[PDB]
Design a protein around this nucleic acid. Structure first.
Ligand code: AGS
Ligand code: AGS
Ligand code: AGS
Ligand code: MG
Ligand code: MG
Ligand code: MG
Lengths: 285, 113, 437, 160, 249, 319
DNA sequence: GATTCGTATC
């Protein structure tokens, strides 16, 4: 076999594949394979991209007995996996084995309950949104539970569109808020400056080198896209934000080697900038 | 049906019943393993049996309907000694004995492999 | 500051632009449902838009309800999206709370804005609930007044299911056969306001705006524009809105009013006998197609033309013209709903009737096609044939095709069974009943 | 593996210099690219005259490398109802551009297969987000296109 | 002008339950502010019911007023005062045409909302609210569209029945599903006959459920006549409850 | 690849004084802007004659600094179902906003001709309940698609097709503001191919400028195509069959026009075609319908179109 | 729109 990987903690694959569920429920999922591990990359409307990585240390066995290409790329339908791996766990080892035998071969998922081996083969189909690391407008490190509560409230309210506020201060009065625009209108959800929740918030002025105070960073995001990160924040311990000048929001979620999630989002063009003045005035008030 | 393997084999036999698109199951035997193979465009399901299996005494594959397999499971539930005989691309003979009162179920192939 | 039709609302029923007979026939009915042990449970008013239905109901409930109050109007609000309640239950809650308006409480109900009836589930719920109100076992109920504005639904995205509410919003396409034909239901169809009432009321609005009207020197012209507005529309609100737009303006803007839809028999008569003031058949048919394409693009319109082309001069015209008309209709039937088919058929019918139209013609009365009657008769025939086939197997093993049933076994087998009946099997009478002439 | 393809999709032009026949259309679109202004195009003509080839070559020339994340292509093989136009097309032509900058392209191949509701929704998307997105409508039959949609597009006719 | 803050969890539970109930009665939660107390009232369009929730000055820790009735959409307000899963430490509601409300969790994350507002202008029965809530909530609003409250000189019986209607041939257009219960006079705390009363069930269910939301228990009912509206009331330390509904004639 | 707005949106008028065409209607709109008592209005006409721009300019000149939260522009691209109508429109109308004395909120409903009927009924309720605080402006192509109960409350304004003089004046303004070289016959050709559409005229002028520079007749007609309805009318009215056949071939078949497009345009032309008798017109309509059926069934060759022309000449030439 | 009958007014 070109690639083989067995594991006994199928809860990781279950939670991992649920982390792609907020995206298209009926579409295709792209899977990279490499010696470091395999990653499930998903994209929607060319405007948002999740990238969930399972490292090699996650599996008790990880071979990758291939050398012709650095990585193996295969694309499969997501709900074929979702329908098939509905095994209801068992309790039985329930050991899961992932296999791939190069191009033209199905993606295999073997489940063994020490007697029964329900082997499932997935047909593979024919086969970007990265922030430029040199330029980061702002970077924030928040705790997972607070962010999950923020998105839960924002979904409770509906939140047709959302905003992100980032304005560090000379006295280190760092402020980070999620401003919405819903049936109620402008609702300001500001996260606290305490080190219990917000552990770091640096707002730059380009090139991500100079920590400039007294200036705010505004991100106009479509909330349907901002909701795709909600389920990932549920298992997250620390959630890292990184927004660049090109209007790309990168969320760095790591449920501590655990699982690592890379959600990249394209930000709205903000047709009218009067709303920007309204938001900043609502903030300073 | 009674013993260590009694519940395990019953579960393996009945594991085919948890899908609504399974009408033609495809038994398979290699000289041993008992593989129930389901053919669909969604995903090629290949239920097997890893437990040690004996012979009453080369591939032998027979496609039958699912109601016949339900009758087979019901027979296995109430029978201690059961014999599963396979005719390559022909028929499946389910011999059940009670050491004597004997039950034989003759099942005809539904599709040619 | 305010719209003219809003600040010039009648203060009394003497100021309302309604016919005398219509006012009397609504007043007598409203009194009839007001007296205890009333025969008429609900009242249904139907008609075009802005025919002063709601206004007369306001004034009648203003000077009638107080007479029977022991010691106003209540309207349904479809916009009331109340918490914890599904949308389909809003009208249920409203009706359940509004039936507690009998003793020590009296308020006539006006269902002016209906619930969303284009959704089939809640439309059926509306039908069932209003039927439960009609068939209610309660000792007495407050009078129910429902106003329906008859408007044609214009064409939209090509998906039509109800076939009734999707072509016309009327009392017939909302309410079912049981609801309208009910002893306790009263229906008063309304008519557009005539030109006399419009002229008088527009004159009243002018004589109440003389200063401004005299300020812009438009009072030496108001009479001609009032006559034009009265002739153009039969809508009081639209007439007053157009008059306000003309008066408040300071230029030569053309006076434009909303265009009223053309009915079914109106379109049939326009195709058959032509249209007055339009001696151009081409332009009349063109405007008929642009404005009422929903009505003209149907099989029912061709059926109506076929059924009613004999009403021209009481069938007293040449058979060559009739042959030409039916030939063109048959040719149009071979084009499967293309616009060219309808255009050609209507144009040919109009041309044929124009070349033979002269003075001294006494035409007949048009009628709706009887095709639905034939469909019901065919359904009854299908049921009887199915029954005969069912009897014709278990009694004696025999399978007969339906074509043979329609041809021979619908006549000869009942004849045999009747002869067997006389010298003595369930099916003894002829299938579909006897034939006549 | 271009030797493993039919001759039709083996000699498909990759650059605008390889699209023969339509001299005027190619010259005008090249001028549009050079000047930096691209209007909402509409390519109309008989089948097999170089419409998809021209639009894909033009998009490749405008975005040499960002073509994957700079062009949204839809055709009759993809569902394009009212919901697709409302969600996918609007969200694509409502977000800021990738890399440094530019304008996003939305190619509608075989747009005569779209319903009138979808085109009626699309017209306001065309008129509202034109600052950073341009549309290309490809069609063999112009009578299936709403007159408003034809109004808000620049017509280029592909002769046989 | 008006400003109020509640620091106690059960008080917030009562506020949320009351707001939800007034939202379920009418889409607009009419609110007026008085220095003595804050009263929230709602009127259904049918005008057959009237529920009012009174929040006294002692309910809030600092009920400052510097002057007022304003109409607020019910659904918007009921999604603001909800308790998120996994602890609001301060609910400050104030107005100085936008209502300002400030919410902060125990984790110090702070939210603000700006809803729009519109300025606008016998016998006695005292029964345990627990048993009444049991029977009432056990009933389903879908099947039951009518309540039958009858008191006997020995026992008190309440049933959730339905007014049956018959069509052309005794057609069962509406059935008569009658979930019934019988309660003796020992459970009834105070009865004074000095009787059959028919009204609705959903509003009664919501009003009854309002009460026990405080984990700190009787409801008083005075009524007379079939065409006259019944009174309905409950009392809390800083919260006063009222319901007026027109009875069936 | 660069930054340059197309002339259609770069030169969209921002004030009512820059809109050409229906002078009386625009003057009335300016009066509404100054007094401020805007009634419910319906705007209908051909595409690209200044309907959306008129509405938005009226909203701006009526609301000023309050335009940000004073208009609720909903369009076909946005969801406008019954629930959306109810919730959003009701909440916007119930929003109490202090405005200047003679001012109201404005609810622009562009493409109201593509709105579901139940949403129109909900609009009826909202229109008749919150009329004292907000006003509705419907922009549509044909007023038939708005239900009669809604047209009852509105002051109907009908935008006529733009005359050649108004479009010429706007073209001259844009030219003397963009510095393009032109010829009188070139602007005449742009006017002729625009056919009463300002947006099409601007697009054709920009295309000619970008492709060739100087705007004369030759460049315009080598980049833009004469309206094919006119060619269809020319071929249907031809005297003999040979000339009609030659026109069809060299002007519609060699130019790359679909046969279904030719047939549909022929039907539309025949509907509005004077100087022909009623019998002749309906016979031509019948023959066009038969040929349309043959095209729809798959037989869409040039022989079918030639046969349709031959039958038309038989009927109109007493042949 | 056509017919018939009935009003109301000038
Ligand atoms: N002289 C008048 N007589 C009657 N109504 C008048 C008069 N002058 C103005 N109006 C107004 O005209 C309108 C007519 O409304 P109605 O016809 O009663 O309601 P409607 O029949 O339901 O109209 P639709 O179908 O809802 S558009 C009312 O708003 C009246 O205030
Ligand atoms: N101008 C041209 N120059 C060179 N090859 C061309 C040209 N036009 C068409 N072709 C060839 O035709 C093939 C398919 O034509 P396309 O242009 O891709 O299809 P199309 O023009 O969009 O027609 P439709 O409307 O899609 S059926 C291409 O792969 C080329 O090989
Ligand atoms: N009368 C006019 N004066 C000046 N520019 C005009 C005029 N009419 C249209 N335009 C131009 O046309 C574009 C906008 O036209 P619109 O008014 O949006 O078209 P429309 O009348 O709304 O037709 P539809 O139905 O929306 S396709 C802008 O580029 C305007 O400059
Ligand atoms: Mg009314
Ligand atoms: Mg193509
Ligand atoms: Mg427009």
């Amino acid at each position: 076999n070109k690639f083989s990987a067995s594991t006994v903690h199928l809860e990781h694959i279950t939670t991992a594949l649920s982390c792609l569920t907020p995206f298209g429920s009926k579409d295709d999922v792209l899977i990279f394979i490499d010696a470091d591990g395999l990653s499930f990359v998903r994209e929607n409307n060319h405007v948002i991209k999740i990238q969930l990585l399972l490292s090699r240390e996650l599996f008790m066995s990880y071979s990758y007995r291939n050398e012709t290409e650095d990585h193996m790329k295969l694309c499969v339908k997501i709900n074929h996996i979702l329908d098939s791996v509905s095994v209801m766990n068992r309790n039985d080892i329930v050991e899961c084995t992932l296999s791939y035998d190069g191009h033209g071969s199905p993606f295999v998922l073997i489940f063994e309950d020490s007697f029964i081996s329900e082997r499932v083969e997935y047909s593979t189909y024919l086969i970007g949104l990265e922030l430029d690391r040199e330029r980061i407008s702002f970077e924030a490190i928040i705790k997972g539970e607070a962010l999950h509560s923020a998105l839960k409230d924002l979904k409770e309210i509906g939140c047709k569109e959302c905003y992100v506020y980032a304005k560090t201060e000379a006295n280190d009065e760092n402020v980070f808020a999620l401003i919405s625009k819903s049936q109620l209108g402008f609702s300001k959800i500001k996260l606290p400056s305490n080190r219990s929740i917000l552990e770091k918030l640096q707002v730059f002025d380009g090139d991500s080198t100079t920590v400039i105070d007294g200036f705010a960073v505004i991100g106009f995001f479509d909330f349907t896209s901002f909701d795709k990160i909600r389920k990932s924040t549920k298992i997250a311990s620390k959630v890292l934000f990184r927004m660049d000048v090109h209007g790309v929001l990168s969320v760095n979620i790591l449920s501590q080697p655990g699982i690592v999630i890379e959600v990249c989002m394209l930000e709205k063009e903000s047709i009218d900038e009067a709303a920007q003045t309204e938001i900043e005035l609502l903030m300073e008030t | 049906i009674s013993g260590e393997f009694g519940s395990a084999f019953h579960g393996f036999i009945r594991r085919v019943e948890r899908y609504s698109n399974v009408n033609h199951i495809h038994l398979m035997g290699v000289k041993v393993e008992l593989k129930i193979i389901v053919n669909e465009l969604d995903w090629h399901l290949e239920i097997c049996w890893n437990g040690p299996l004996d012979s009453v005494i080369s591939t032998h594959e027979v496609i039958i309907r699912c109601k016949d397999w339900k009758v087979c499971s019901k027979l296995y539930a109430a029978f201690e000694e059961v014999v599963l005989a396979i005719s390559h691309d022909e028929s499946c003979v389910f011999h059940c004995s009670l050491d004597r009162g004997q039950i034989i179920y003759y099942i005809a192939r539904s599709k040619g492999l | 500051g305010e719209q003219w039709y809003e600040k010039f609302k009648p203060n009394c029923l003497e100021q309302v632009a309604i016919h005398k007979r219509k006012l009397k026939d609504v007043q007598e009915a409203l009194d009839a449902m007001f007296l205890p042990n009333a025969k008429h449970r609900i009242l249904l008013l139907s008609g075009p838009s802005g025919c002063s239905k709601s206004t007369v109901i306001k004034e009648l409930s203003k000077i009638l309800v107080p007479k029977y109050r022991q010691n106003k109007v209540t309207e349904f609000r479809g916009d009331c999206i109340v918490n914890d309640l599904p949308q389909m239950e809003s009208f249920s809650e409203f009706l359940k709370g509004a039936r507690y308006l009998v003793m020590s409480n009296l308020s006539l109900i006006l269902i002016e804005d209906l619930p969303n009836v284009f959704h089939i589930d809640t439309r059926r719920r509306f039908q069932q609930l209003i039927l439960q109100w009609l068939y209610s076992s309660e000792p007495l109920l407050p009078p129910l007044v429902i106003c329906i504005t008859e408007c044609e639904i214009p064409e939209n995205d090509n998906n039509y299911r109800k076939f009734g509410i999707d072509y016309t919003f009327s009392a017939e396409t909302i309410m079912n056969k049981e609801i309208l034909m009910h002893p306790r239901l009263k229906r008063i169809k309304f008519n557009p306001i005539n030109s006399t009432l419009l002229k008088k009321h527009l004159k009243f609005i002018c004589v109440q705006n003389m200063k401004m009207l005299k300020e812009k020197n438009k009072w030496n012209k108001r009479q001609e524009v009032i006559d034009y507005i009265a002739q153009e529309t039969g809508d009081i609100r639209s007439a007053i809105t157009t008059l306000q737009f003309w008066a408040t303006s300071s230029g030569s803007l053309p006076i434009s009013t909303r265009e009223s839809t053309i009915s079914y028999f109106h379109a049939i008569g326009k195709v058959i006998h032509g249209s007055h003031s339009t001696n151009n058949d081409n332009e009349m048919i063109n405007n008929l197609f642009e404005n009422s394409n929903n009505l003209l693009s149907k099989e029912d319109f061709k059926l109506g033309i076929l059924e009613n082309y004999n009403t021209f001069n009481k069938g007293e015209f040449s058979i060559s013209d009739a042959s030409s008309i039916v030939d063109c209709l048959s040719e149009c039937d071979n084009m499967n709903g293309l616009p060219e088919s309808n255009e050609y058929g209507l144009r040919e019918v109009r041309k044929t009737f124009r070349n033979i139209s002269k003075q001294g013609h006494n035409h007949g009365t048009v009628y709706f096609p009887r095709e639905w009657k034939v469909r019901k008769l065919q359904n009854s025939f299908k049921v009887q044939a199915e029954d005969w086939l069912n009897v014709s197997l278990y009694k004696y093993n025999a399978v007969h095709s339906f074509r043979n049933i329609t041809l021979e076994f619908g006549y000869y087998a009942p004849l045999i069974r009747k002869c067997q009946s006389y010298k003595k099997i369930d099916v003894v009478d002829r299938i579909g009943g006897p034939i006549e002439a | 593996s271009k030797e493993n393809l039919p001759w039709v999709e083996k000699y498909r032009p990759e650059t605008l210099d390889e699209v023969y026949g339509q001299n005027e259309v190619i010259t005008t679109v090249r001028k549009f690219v050079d000047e930096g202004k691209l209007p909402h195009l509409l390519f109309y003509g008989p089948p097999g005259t170089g419409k998809t080839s021209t639009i894909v070559a033009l998009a490749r020339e405008i975005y040499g490398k960002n073509y994957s994340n700079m062009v949204l292509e839809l055709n009759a093989s993809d569902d394009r109802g009212i919901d697709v136009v409302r969600n996918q097309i609007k969200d694509f032509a409502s977000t800021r551009q990738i890399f440094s900058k530019g304008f996003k392209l939305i190619i509608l191949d075989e747009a005569d297969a779209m319903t009138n509701a979808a085109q009626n929704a699309l017209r306001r998307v065309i008129e509202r987000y034109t600052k950073n997105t341009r549309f290309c409508v490809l069609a063999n039959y112009a009578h299936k296109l709403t007159p408003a949609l034809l109004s808000r597009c620049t017509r280029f006719r592909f002769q046989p | 002008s008006f400003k109020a803050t509640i620091t106690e969890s059960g008080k917030q539970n009562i506020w949320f339950r009351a707001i939800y109930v007034l939202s379920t009665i009418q889409d607009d939660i009419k609110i007026t502010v008085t220095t003595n107390e804050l009263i929230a009232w709602s009127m259904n369009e049918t005008d057959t019911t009237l529920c009012q929730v009174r929040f006294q000055k002692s309910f809030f820790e600092e009920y400052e007023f510097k002057p007022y009735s304003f109409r607020v959409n019910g659904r918007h307000l009921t999604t603001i005062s909800r308790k998120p899963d996994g602890g609001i430490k301060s609910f400050t509601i104030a107005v100085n045409n936008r209502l300002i409300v400030v919410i902060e969790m125990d984790s110090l994350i702070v939210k603000e909302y700006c809803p729009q507002f519109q300025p606008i202008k016998i016998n006695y029965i005292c029964c345990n609210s627990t048993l009444l809530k049991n029977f009432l909530d056990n009933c389903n609003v879908n099947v039951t569209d009518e309540v039958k409250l009858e008191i006997n000189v020995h026992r008190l019986s309440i049933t959730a029945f339905t007014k049956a209607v018959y069509g052309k041939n005794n057609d069962l257009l509406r059935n008569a599903l009658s979930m019934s219960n019988t309660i003796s006079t020992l459970d009834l705390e105070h009865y004074c006959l000095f009787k059959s009363i028919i009204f609705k069930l959903k509003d009664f269910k919501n009003f009854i459920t309002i009460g026990p939301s405080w984990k700190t228990d009787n409801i008083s009912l005075w009524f007379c006549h079939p065409g006259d509206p019944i009174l309905m009331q409950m009392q809390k330390p800083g919260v006063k409850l009222e319901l007026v509904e027109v009875t069936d004639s | 690849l660069s930054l340059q707005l197309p002339w259609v949106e770069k030169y969209r008028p921002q004030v009512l004084s820059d809109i050409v065409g229906n002078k009386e209607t625009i003057d009335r709109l300016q009066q509404i802007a100054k007094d401020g008592n805007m009634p419910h209005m319906i705007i209908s006409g051909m595409p690209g004659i200044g309907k959306t721009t008129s509405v938005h300019c009226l909203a701006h000149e009526l609301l000023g600094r309050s335009y940000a939260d004073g208009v609720l522009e909903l369009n076909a691209s946005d969801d406008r179902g019954i629930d959306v109508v109810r919730n959003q429109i009701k909440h916007f109308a119930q929003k109490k906003l202090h405005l200047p004395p003679g001012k109201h909120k404005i609810v622009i409903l562009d493409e109201a001709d593509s709105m579901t009927a139940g949403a129109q009924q909900a609009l009826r309720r909202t229109m008749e309940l919150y009329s004292n605080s907000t006003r509705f402006a419907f922009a549509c192509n044909q007023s038939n698609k708005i239900i009669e109960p809604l047209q009852s409350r509105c002051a109907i304004l009908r935008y006529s097709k733009l005359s050649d003089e108004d479009v010429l004046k706007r073209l001259l303004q844009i030219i003397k503001l963009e510095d393009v070289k032109y010829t009188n016959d070139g602007l005449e050709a742009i006017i002729f191919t625009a056919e009463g559409d300002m947006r099409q005229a601007i697009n054709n002028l920009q295309s000619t400028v970008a492709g060739h520079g100087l705007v004369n007749a030759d460049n315009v007609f080598k980049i833009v195509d004469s309206p094919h309805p006119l060619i269809v009318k020319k071929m249907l009215l031809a005297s003999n069959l040979e000339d009609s056949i030659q026109i069809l071939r060299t002007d519609l078949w060699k130019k790359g026009y679909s046969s279904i497009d030719i047939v549909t345009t022929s039907f539309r032309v025949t509907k509005n075609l004077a100087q022909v008798k009623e019998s002749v017109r309906l016979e031509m309509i019948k023959e066009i319908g038969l040929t349309h059926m043959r095209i729809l069934e798959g037989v869409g060759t040039y022989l079918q179109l030639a046969s349709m022309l031959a039958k038309i000449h038989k009927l109109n030439n007493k042949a």
